[PDB]
Ligand binder design. Structure first.
Ligand SMILES: [Cl-]
Ligand SMILES: [Cl-]
Lengths: 166, 223
């Protein structure tokens, strides 16, 4: 594709080097955080938490040796610094959420996400097996939390803010 | 370029800078007076291309040209399989007059030779995570197909080859995409993809295997 992903200042989003907040377009009062899911003792699920704004910043990574991100590129999304792979996103079946966004400490060369234009911002789309069919990431309300999870046709729409406040 | 040095000025006169709002995002390679080869992942609907550069400031580079291009042709099997067939041809709006600082390079007909030392050039990130002010050059050595496939399967395809991974930590890096890998006087590859951080020992970068595409390139340029 031609379409370059841009931040809230209109600047191309960097390939891994800079961090960004995923700021929901109608939930700017809330931000990404980790929470417990199922019977797990460690918080490994990604939620939109009304107590954290702007929330945990992310980096977008492609193996391509380019310094910008296109909507067409398969991406890894991760929390933490460039040097760490302990915050890498994946999508995992977990009742009763469904296909939940969770953090891994392992990473494929080519991740399973794309960042696609939607409305006034972007949505995150998950491509099982890096195929042709994408599933929108939205919100699933369970146990008083708003989990990021597959909700095809009901995406959570984000703008992308460079994390220069840190 | 990781663990390289400033190029001898204008020693790579085929080098093209692809710029977006006055900032470099990819390189390419002049292969005909009206055509620039680059990586297909660098596709845009239009281009601003810097030729004859060393620094990226054309107003400080005698002999340089900043030229427009609208038309580009991605290889028809780009990204099937994923990351494969990573080349495109950009047709300049007008043919450039070649000089000692703006000159086309011939493409290798023969496949890469395992072990051979080659040169890669670009304006991408340095080991310190900063962008250079002038074009950088480094040597990397071609790795066998057996080693490339072991490291990169299931994404290794023969439209690719690997180079680097030495103890010397010499590599290409982000912003080097589309730029040249020169072997034994000929254009052998384009910078395509690899791992980050760049320059890991035992981890070569991946280059477009241009010997597989000499017929498609010649037919596209002649059509
Ligand atoms: Cl803003
Ligand atoms: Cl369970």
């Amino acid at each position: 594709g031609s379409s370059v992903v841009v931040d809230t200042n209109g600047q191309p989003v960097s390939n891994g080097a800079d961090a960004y907040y995923l700021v929901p377009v109608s939930h700017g009062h809330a931000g990404l955080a980790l929470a417990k899911i199922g019977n797990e003792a460690e918080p490994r699920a990604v939620v939109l938490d009304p107590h954290h704004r702007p929330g945990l910043p992310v980096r977008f990574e492609s193996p391509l040796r380019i310094n910008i991100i296109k909507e067409s590129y398969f991406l890894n999304i991760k929390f933490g610094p460039s040097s760490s792979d302990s915050g890498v996103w994946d999508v995992i079946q977990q009742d009763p959420i469904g296909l939940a966004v969770k953090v891994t400490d392992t990473k494929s060369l080519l991740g399973p996400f794309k960042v696609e234009k939607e409305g006034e911002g972007y949505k995150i789309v998950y491509y099982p097996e890096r195929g042709q069919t994408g599933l929108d990431i939205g919100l699933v309300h369970r146990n008083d939390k708003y989990y990021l999870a597959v909700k095809d046709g009901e995406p959570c729409v984000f703008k992308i803010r460079k994390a220069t406040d840190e | 370029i990781i663990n390289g040095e400033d190029c001898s000025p204008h020693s790579q006169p085929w080098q093209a800078a692809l710029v977006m709002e006055n900032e470099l995002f990819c390189s390419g390679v002049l292969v005909h007076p009206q055509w620039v080869l680059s990586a297909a992942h660098c596709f845009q609907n239009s281009y601003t291309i810097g030729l004859g550069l060393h620094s990226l400031e054309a107003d400080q580079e005698p002999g340089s040209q900043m030229v427009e291009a609208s038309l580009s042709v991605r290889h028809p099997e780009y990204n099937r399989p994923l990351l494969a067939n990573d080349l495109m041809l950009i047709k300049l709006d007008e043919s450039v007059s070649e000089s000692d600082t703006i000159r086309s390079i011939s493409i290798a007909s023969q496949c890469p030779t395992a072990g051979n030392s080659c040169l890669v050039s670009g304006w991408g990130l340095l080991a310190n995570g900063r962008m250079p002010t002038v074009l950088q050059c480094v040597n990397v050595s071609v790795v066998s197909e057996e080693v490339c496939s072991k490291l990169y399967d299931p994404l290794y395809h023969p439209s690719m080859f690997c180079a680097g991974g030495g103890q010397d930590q010499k590599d290409s890096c982000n912003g080097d995409s589309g730029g040249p890998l020169i072997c034994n006087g000929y254009l052998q590859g384009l910078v395509s993809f690899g791992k980050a951080p760049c320059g890991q020992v035992g981890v070569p970068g991946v280059y477009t295997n241009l010997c597989k595409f000499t017929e498609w390139i010649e037919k596209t340029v002649q059509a």
